[PDB]
Design a protein around this ligand. Sequence first.
Ligand SMILES: O=C1NC(=O)[C@@]2(N1)O[C@H](CO)[C@@H](O)[C@H](O)[C@H]2O
Ligand SMILES: O=C1NC(=O)[C@@]2(N1)O[C@H](CO)[C@@H](O)[C@H](O)[C@H]2O
Ligand SMILES: *Cc1c(COP(=O)(O)O)cnc(C)c1O
Ligand SMILES: *Cc1c(COP(=O)(O)O)cnc(C)c1O
Lengths: 830, 830
Amino acid sequence: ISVRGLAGVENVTELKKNFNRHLHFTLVKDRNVATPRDYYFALAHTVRDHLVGRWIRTQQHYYEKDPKRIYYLSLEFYMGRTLQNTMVNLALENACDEATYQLGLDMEELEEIEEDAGLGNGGLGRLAACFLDSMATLGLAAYGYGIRYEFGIFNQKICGGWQMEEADDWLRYGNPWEKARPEFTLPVHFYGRVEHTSQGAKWVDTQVVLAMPYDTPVPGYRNNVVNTMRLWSAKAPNDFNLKDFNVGGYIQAVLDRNLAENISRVLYPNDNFFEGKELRLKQEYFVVAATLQDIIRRFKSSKFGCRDPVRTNFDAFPDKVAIQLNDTHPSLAIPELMRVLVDLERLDWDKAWEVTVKTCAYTNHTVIPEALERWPVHLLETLLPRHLQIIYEINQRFLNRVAAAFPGDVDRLRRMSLVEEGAVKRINMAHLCIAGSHAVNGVARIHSEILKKTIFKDFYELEPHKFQNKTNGITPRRWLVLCNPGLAEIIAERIGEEYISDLDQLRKLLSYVDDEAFIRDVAKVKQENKLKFAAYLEREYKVHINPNSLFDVQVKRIHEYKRQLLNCLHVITLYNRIKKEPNKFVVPRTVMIGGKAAPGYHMAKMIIKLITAIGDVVNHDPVVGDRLRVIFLENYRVSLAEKVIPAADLSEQISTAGTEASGTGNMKFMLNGALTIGTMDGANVEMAEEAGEENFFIFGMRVEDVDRLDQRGYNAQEYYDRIPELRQIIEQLSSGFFSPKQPDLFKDIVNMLMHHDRFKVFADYEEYVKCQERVSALYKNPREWTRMVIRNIATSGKFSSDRTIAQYAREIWGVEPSRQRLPAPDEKIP
Amino acid sequence: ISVRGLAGVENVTELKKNFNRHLHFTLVKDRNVATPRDYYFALAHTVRDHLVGRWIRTQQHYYEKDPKRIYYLSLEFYMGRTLQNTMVNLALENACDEATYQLGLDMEELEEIEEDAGLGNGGLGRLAACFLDSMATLGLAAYGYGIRYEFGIFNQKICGGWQMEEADDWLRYGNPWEKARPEFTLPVHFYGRVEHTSQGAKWVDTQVVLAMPYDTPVPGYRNNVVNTMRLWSAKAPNDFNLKDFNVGGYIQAVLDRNLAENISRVLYPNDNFFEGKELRLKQEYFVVAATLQDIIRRFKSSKFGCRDPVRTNFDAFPDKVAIQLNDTHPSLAIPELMRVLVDLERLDWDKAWEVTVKTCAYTNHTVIPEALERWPVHLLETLLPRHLQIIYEINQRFLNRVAAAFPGDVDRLRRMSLVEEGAVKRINMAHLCIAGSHAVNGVARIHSEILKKTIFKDFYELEPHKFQNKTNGITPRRWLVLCNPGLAEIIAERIGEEYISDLDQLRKLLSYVDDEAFIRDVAKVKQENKLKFAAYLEREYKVHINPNSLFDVQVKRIHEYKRQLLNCLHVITLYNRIKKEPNKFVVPRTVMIGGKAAPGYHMAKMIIKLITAIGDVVNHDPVVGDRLRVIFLENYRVSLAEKVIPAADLSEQISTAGTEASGTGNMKFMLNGALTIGTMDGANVEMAEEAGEENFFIFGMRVEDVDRLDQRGYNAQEYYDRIPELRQIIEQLSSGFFSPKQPDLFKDIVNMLMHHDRFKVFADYEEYVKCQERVSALYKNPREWTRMVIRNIATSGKFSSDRTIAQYAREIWGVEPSRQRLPAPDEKIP
Ligand SMILES: O=C1NC(=O)[C@@]2(N1)O[C@H](CO)[C@@H](O)[C@H](O)[C@H]2O
Ligand SMILES: O=C1NC(=O)[C@@]2(N1)O[C@H](CO)[C@@H](O)[C@H](O)[C@H]2O
Ligand SMILES: *Cc1c(COP(=O)(O)O)cnc(C)c1O
Ligand SMILES: *Cc1c(COP(=O)(O)O)cnc(C)c1O
């Protein structure tokens, strides 16, 4: 059937009876009233059974051996569905396929019923998910820590061409994967004040909110390791949230509990944008406070909570603990770790600081200013008074370090301050992270260089040793074997299965680049993939596309820096050329643009309306026929990504050079047989570098060119004046060609494009359509297109998260990865 | 061990491995980290497994045979713990006891970990629970319908002698008994307006709240019948509760969902008191609207949703459906049933009315005016506009009936109106229920007579056939076999086990009233019970009592009509007499008073403070010694009741004649070997009537005497003037003898007692202490005390809820009870 594992005789039988056990005993249903959803759960519960045994021994293992623990703190974990992924990592896919088949059910149909764990916005969230899978696969004692939002990223609906947001009630029918652990609930404080008494400061008169943990298993790839993702839920105490007496109402008191529990209710839908709302800050301290107590408790036990030197010496803390800050979101971990060590454990400042710096590491994910976290002091002052005091003290000592290093450099002092003066004082969270971490890394080579050269230049001059780079990657399991079994099978037929946990072995595919059978096969799976997606489209969304055309897709969050607008300009150009010479042949294309716009991002939502507007015109022009289709992919999410990417021919990664930190979608397309048209931005550079620029479609300004233009000054009118095709499009938008009933509908876009384009869309227009002509030319030659594809696939190995994690492990965490199978799952009951 | 069933060889082994399966696979724990709470859940899950098989066949059964369905609507279901009860009804108690013993665990210790399902306030709620158990035991196709509050009756805490209320988060660790059924969610409307168009009225522009059902199994006693209790939870739709666009905030929109979900958040803690809050009314319509849709859907299928006459003829609706209104709380079912039939199904008014009256039955539970539901018209007008219109139309037609029957009786017209004019117009829910139900019943013989003679006199004259009586009862299973296995065993040793489902057989115990061994045994279990409670007291609450004293207990909600105050006056009297003649012998007593006061009931909370105040003085007077102890039983609830009642010697049922509708606690004490000192109120009359007044301690005014006094006019000063002992107590309260630091602390009680005593406490004082002297005298003669006890126990059979239900079944529902074992639980998988 494929190498989705063995469909053993004893195990298919075993699976079937356990499916029935759960359908009866767990679901309390009988075959005569069971619906596909019930069947999905019976299976989910059956699959989940297979990894509890391993989950228990893994955790017990780490307790016995006591290795250095890795704590990945992130406010986002974009997990997606987990049934198939679990089958794949446990080698259960074929057995389950067989068993459910024998039970008369279609496994694929049941898999489609599982709701996505949308606890993320995009790249940052998904990176965390891929990292978790890799950390498990590399046998690291790692824990993912975050917030269990009851509402994930909103579900996008397109009404009249506009995006409509609606709550993602992903828990509505329950989550068979999580395990509530009420017994490990912890208290988290807010507000209050600071009392300075005799021997130390005291955080007093605080409001208490409780943190209830929920553990989700994270299985490694076929190694019997099952790590843990712990997600905190907010709960109100039953005392004060009722007991602070003297009139108000008993009923009201109980109803008001949903005020402390609002902390974990919803994920902020912002991607690469900072919103200084109090609720956000609370979510940030909430996950940090709760996680740290869990971390220290585990440390207090270790082998110190037995003997060792005997005296809670936190000197070995860094040797046993490593906490990775996914961006500045969990930044409060630094002043919180200090607070506990100093205020509660009573360590001297300097010893506590040494410990903190040595266990904390920070990862930066963007350089755009509006994405930077700068919290107003008055907010921290009211909500976390002691933390503010600690931050000021950290600042005081840090700046003294700077003054001593750069005597008389008074401007450098204000520039490096964690505290920013002005309208309202703010705290630069990024500066805090750098000062309190022993390592700061970027997510792509150019991004990392930019940090050193620009944004964090002064910090780099101060401590050059802190700055590193760790190019992002993606997990080959979900992003290849799971979403594209067809491609994975033909690759395995030639080079084996060892590449799934060793993606570098894909290079061996280079020697089949002239193999006639392979070229035919690679081309076949892509055709099968395109047909399946073309079908899904009519199935779930309804209104035809042509599977023979080039599948031009751009899927990612909607941003001005991602330049979906530049993609739009090209689409309109193609249209206009066709209307000019109707009877001239052009390579057919289906351009699919999908992504979600943050609710408050007006421009982004305007762009979505533009895309649908172009489709309205283009898709109903008889002269165009089937040569050009414009489709907006609704509710783009992880599960949707697993469907489009394997069916894509052209991947669009056209951000303005220097704005996309790394990107990961680009890698997903490269490993799945799509060719990349993009700019020398983020990881695109390392991808072209790995496959060879000849096998990549690079165009536009480099970072240097962008800066040259800024010195000069960017004037869009110039481009409007010298390019008639560009002029024609802008005047089409301005006159209502794309919005008849509302002719001025797109005035904001035009206005912006001409007067305040921060991402110089016009500047890359000419080189973009010229480059698009080159991909069309190559698509006309199926054999050469497929051969270039094989060059990309065979050369994508570097982009696996196993590589990225192995580097974090060695160069930042100080631990050694291991591909050693944990001693089976085998029963056992001590 | 007792007749808690057989501890079979094959089943104890089977139990043990399933306990281990759940501890591993369900709880995801290993013996080395498992806590008593984990062990409790493993067992709970193991026990729950045994009744799903039966649950499924019972429900399937009713679907095949299609008998008349009984729907018990109540806003309260006081269930208590359900682990032991389930073991008892499935004959699993000994097997589980053995198995857990072999696993090295104490079952009793694990049972104490289960949280109480406190979805009730007291009597009314508990009656519903006992009814459910009886309906299952009598094989009725019955369904309990209510609200799944996430916070039940508050947990009472005594701080400085004052009651402190704190949220009852009973779901904190989960509920292994319920089964969420998201797939059967239903929509419920609120607000909106009424449009009168061409062919009918339309309820329009309504706010939608969703009702998610949760089913809990209700097993019959050893008959393999497992009925269903369906509890609705409120959920916000994800559309409008987000989709009603045009600024407000996306985050805020999601946070505001907890506004529609507040409907099922908390139970109103009022007992025998009406609070016209909007949230209450919403909870009332919510449970009614959701339940009715479920009822009609089931009816639409039946055997009509196949063939029959073919044409949705609701003429057979009454023949297939019966809905019992537990008080006036679910009264809106009447106008709602009309609304659906008329507005949606399009039946003519008269046909719809005939159907409604024929399927609805109402049960009254109190005659005190402040407990009567009278909803302001402006509230119904805004929240349920169409229902108001229907109620007015019902009223219009009903009054026309009256006018025709009593021509010219204009005062009778206004008196009988469902609409009450005055300050603000109100709707008398009780009048609505009578008009729209074919049967109205009281809960005790005298209570029922009072309804006919007083409160509903005019309605009785109009339709005398509607009025009936159904004396309350309690379930012998939980209230005897479960809480008192020792007594149940010795009874079984003599007369067998058939009395558990046939309590009348207890009469056969009369012939052992002179049996020397039996007297010794009955006396022994009561002593063992008293020792166990005396131990629990020091265990969980701490500060000694004497097990040799008479256990004088009064446990029920705190009310002025229950007269805990009268009990207080007696306690103080005993104290004063002892202080007068210290060296005179008196029968030792431990008087225990427990109960909860509604948060807003100032007097009730003042009484609790008085009780603790008396204990402070009395319990620390050296001259008193161990002859008199005053103890306030904290957090009185079902699980606490299962502990005190079996250890009681004297049961206090001293309400003012004519105010306690029936009472059920009184019955619990009678079946458990306690003697009753009480008034000729509620069911006390039928109890004394059954055991013989010689075996009862009756005192005080009868209803007649109370009325005579009211004609005359009640003047408490008179009693104060003629009784020096009474005078002494009042002056002790007035001067601070019981409240040194705050001498005027009890001015409200004294003031009330002397000037506004609605329940004439002083009037029954003399006859009360005189009567108390008689019980002390008899307690001095152990052999005669025990013989009178045997007379009560042997004569309590009439008070089983099986008898009550059998009467409802035959005289109101039109169904025949059956003690036929359902065809085993046996596997089966069609
Ligand atoms: O705030 C961000 N959202 C992202 O997706 C992001 N930063 O992080 C991702 C993971 O490092 C990057 O790939 C992406 O380029 C960057 O925009
Ligand atoms: O509102 C009420 N609360 C009660 O306990 C009550 N009415 O109903 C119970 C069950 O019918 C009665 O036993 C009780 O006497 C009555 O007060
Ligand atoms: C991989 C992924 C992303 C990141 O895409 P980029 O192109 O790096 O912005 C965003 N959303 C989803 C659903 C993803 O799978
Ligand atoms: C039986 C019961 C009641 C009713 O007691 P009465 O004496 O009828 O008021 C109230 N509370 C609990 C916990 C009960 O078990």
